[PDB]
Amino acid sequence: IVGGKVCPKGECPWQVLLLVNGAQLCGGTLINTIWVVSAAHCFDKIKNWRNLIAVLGEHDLSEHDGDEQSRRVAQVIIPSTYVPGTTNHDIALLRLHQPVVLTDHVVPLCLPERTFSERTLAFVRFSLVSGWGQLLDRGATALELMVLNVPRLMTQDCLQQSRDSPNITEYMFCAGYSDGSKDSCKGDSGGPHATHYRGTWYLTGIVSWGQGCATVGHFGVYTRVSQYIEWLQKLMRSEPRPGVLLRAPFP
C-alpha cells in the first residue's frame, strides 16, 4: 500500500495473509469461519499446493503476539473463465482445512447480496484497501498491516481519466488516484476493498492489477465482487473435492 497508514491492530480483522513455504504471497478476506476470498492470479505460480497457509489476526510480521491463527488452505477454487497471466475474472475462493475461531482480532467481512451491492454499495464513493504490500513502487513491503481510503470511479470515467494496457471489463472497477500519491500494490493482491454502509463493512472488491504502483495517469483495478456472489454462494454450499486446486464453471 502506497500513501496509506498503519491499520491499527484489530481494525482490519478480516484481513488474511497468504503464505507459501512461509513466504508472503498475497492478501485475502475472511467472509465466514472457513472461507477466504482472494485473487485468482495469486495462484498462477504455485507448485507447492500443500504448503499454502492463511493467517488471520495478523498485524506485525516481526512478532508473534498470540492473536495470529494459521490454517492450511484445503481448496483453492477459481472460475473456469480466468486465464493464467491475464486480468479478467480475478477471483479465488479458498476453503480452510479447519475453521478459524472468531475473536476480537479475527472477524469476517460481510459478503453482500448482489442486488444490495450493485444498487447501493457500488455508489459509496470511498472504501478501504489493505495489505502488507510495497510501501513504494520498487520498494520494500510493510512489516505492519497498512490501509488506504480510495474513491471508486465509473468505468467510463476511469477510461477518460487514464493516461497497450488491458481492457477494464464489467468484472472489474477502478479506484484510487491518478496523481501517483496513493494506491494498493502487487504485494497487496487478493486483499479486500471494504465498503462501509449504515454501520457495517462489506466486501466489494479484491486488489487485482494495475501498472507499477501509484504511477501517474493510472488507477488501481479491482475485481468487481458483485458479479460473483451467486458463484461464491453456490460453492460455499458444496462438498470438498480431493486435490487443492478446483476450476469451477462461471457463471
Partner: protein, 56 residues
C-alpha cells in the same frame, strides 16, 4: 421497485414484492427489528463489525 431508491430504507438487504410491498432482510448473524428496517447482531462476532471499535 422501492429497493432501488435509498436501499428501500433497509439497513442491509432489500426484497421487492408485488405492488407497493418491500421486505428488508439481514446477513446471517443478525435479526431484523420490529421497525422492519434495522438489523441487530445475534452473535458475538457478526460480520463487518470491528470489536475494538464496537466495545469503545
Amino acid at each position: 421497485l422501492i429497493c432501488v431508491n435509498e436501499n428501500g430504507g433497509c439497513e442491509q438487504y432489500c426484497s421487492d414484492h408485488t405492488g407497493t410491498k418491500r421486505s428488508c432482510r439481514c446477513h446471517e448473524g443478525y435479526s431484523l427489528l420490529a421497525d422492519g428496517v434495522s438489523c441487530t447482531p445475534t452473535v458475538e462476532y457478526p460480520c463487518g463489525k470491528i470489536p475494538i471499535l464496537e466495545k469503545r
